[PDB]
Amino acid sequence: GGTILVVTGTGTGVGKTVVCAALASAARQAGIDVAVCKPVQTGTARGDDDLAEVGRLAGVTQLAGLARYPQPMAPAAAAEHAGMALPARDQIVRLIADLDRPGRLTLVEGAGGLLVELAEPGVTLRDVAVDVAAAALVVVTADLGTLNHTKLTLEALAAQQVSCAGLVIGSWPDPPGLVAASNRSALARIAMVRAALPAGAASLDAGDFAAMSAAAFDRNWVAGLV
Amino acid sequence: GGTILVVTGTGTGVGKTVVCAALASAARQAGIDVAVCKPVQTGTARGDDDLAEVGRLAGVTQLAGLARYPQPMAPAAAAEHAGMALPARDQIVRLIADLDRPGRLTLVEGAGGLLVELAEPGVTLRDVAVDVAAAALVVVTADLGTLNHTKLTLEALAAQQVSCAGLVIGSWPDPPGLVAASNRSALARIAMVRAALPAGAASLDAGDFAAMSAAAFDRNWVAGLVG
Ligand SMILES: O=C(O)C[C@@H]1CCC[C@H]1C(=O)c1ccccc1O
Ligand SMILES: O=C(O)C[C@@H]1CCC[C@H]1C(=O)c1ccccc1O
Ligand SMILES: Nc1ccn([C@@H]2O[C@H](CO)[C@@H](O)[C@H]2O)c(=O)n1
């Protein structure tokens, strides 16, 4: 059908959701129909709803999820705290495949890092990304330690023949700092860096956001995702 | 030869140095000769000296450095910034081989986290552990996101057939919360949790530290490391 990208990250709180929303905006503005699948969502007591933040920030309406867990833990932990299983792997891949269609960028968002359990039994976002012939975008920080997490994540993909559509620095500080400029350049030798989102971007109104996302990415790479 | 252990971590700041000293201390108390080596050491310009810190807390005398750099950054960076070079793969491996004796436990403390470049080009503590046929002791946190990071690390050890010697939680809070509880239990399900050192164990004095260490590790596991 169309193009299916999983948006993973080297960890929690590296900015997967804001980057998701940002690539989603950029894609829309390039005239691409965007869907966003978020199979499992946790932290729903705190008020977390990444599907909502993407609809709010980038205007996506095709916004698909299966399970919502109140506790702010990895899925498995929050499902065990609820007394409730996790969606089956079948539900996720079938959901994502229904979602996919030609001319549609379907973004697939996981929870935490690449190898966290999403479905039972023991299924990760890496597995889901295999079952739907999806490539992976990797959201990374600029903090001390990010190259190792990146290489680990980049290796865990290659080990399953999951393509790496590249990195995004979820949060770019102002001003950078020695460690941030150094990592940004070192990340660049490791893989193609597609964008570095200015810090605090997740609090912008939908207009400001669409500007930042318009600029942050590269017009040609975006448009060439058809 | 004897037993070589690389001590690595899911990243930086997870307790590698103190775990090195704790295994080292407990091993000494088990009658085991111990050397420790820090092939790459950054942060010297702010007094970072992990060999010295291991000598302090555990009393190991046999300490071997090799590359030292001022800035508190990854070795590739601290070396570009001081105009200096990264040591060569075979110089690291040589520093370790010179320490390896039968009956000796040799600990090789890494520089933040398993895939960090220690030597040009892209030479990691993993490649070293292959060269010297070492097992890897993986230092972890109990914090959020530690599962993913630990699995990625083990997965990277297993892809080069570097045997995992188990995990150590470098700082273990008292009392632990729901998330610390869930991770320690979840962690124990993917690999052997050799220990969970108490928080701030780095501020214990010689006596307290050795008591902590001996308590933290299964004496039979420690003694089983070198025959
Ligand atoms: O989606 C996020 O990364 C932020 C979420 C919001 C609540 C806990 C975070 C989480 O999901 C998570 C945490 C630890 C390990 C795996 C995880 O998936
Ligand atoms: O070794 C540690 O983790 C603590 C040191 C203390 C100074 C920077 C840390 C460091 O070494 C480091 C950090 C990120 C990447 C590679 C690295 O080698
Ligand atoms: N470029 C970026 C990246 C991330 N963020 C912040 O990171 C949070 C995710 O834990 C988001 O909720 C958001 O607060 C941000 O503000 N700007």
From Swiss-Prot, chain B:
ATP binds at D50. The active site is at K38. CTP binds at T12, G13, V14, G15, K16, T17, V18, D50, G170, P198, A199, G200, A201, A202. Pathway: Cofactor biosynthesis; biotin biosynthesis; biotin from 7,8-diaminononanoate: step 1/2. Transmembrane segments: none annotated. Its EC number is 6.3.3.3. Its main location: cytoplasm. Pfam families: AAA_26 (PF13500). Its cofactor is Mg(2+). Keywords: ATP-binding, Biotin biosynthesis, Cytoplasm, Ligase, Magnesium, Metal-binding, Nucleotide-binding. Substrate binds at K38, P39, V40, Q41, T42, G145, T146, L147, N148. Homodimer. This is Dethiobiotin synthetase BioD. It comes from Mycobacterium tuberculosis (strain ATCC 25618 / H37Rv). The lineage of its organism: Bacteria, Bacillati, Actinomycetota, Actinomycetes, Mycobacteriales.
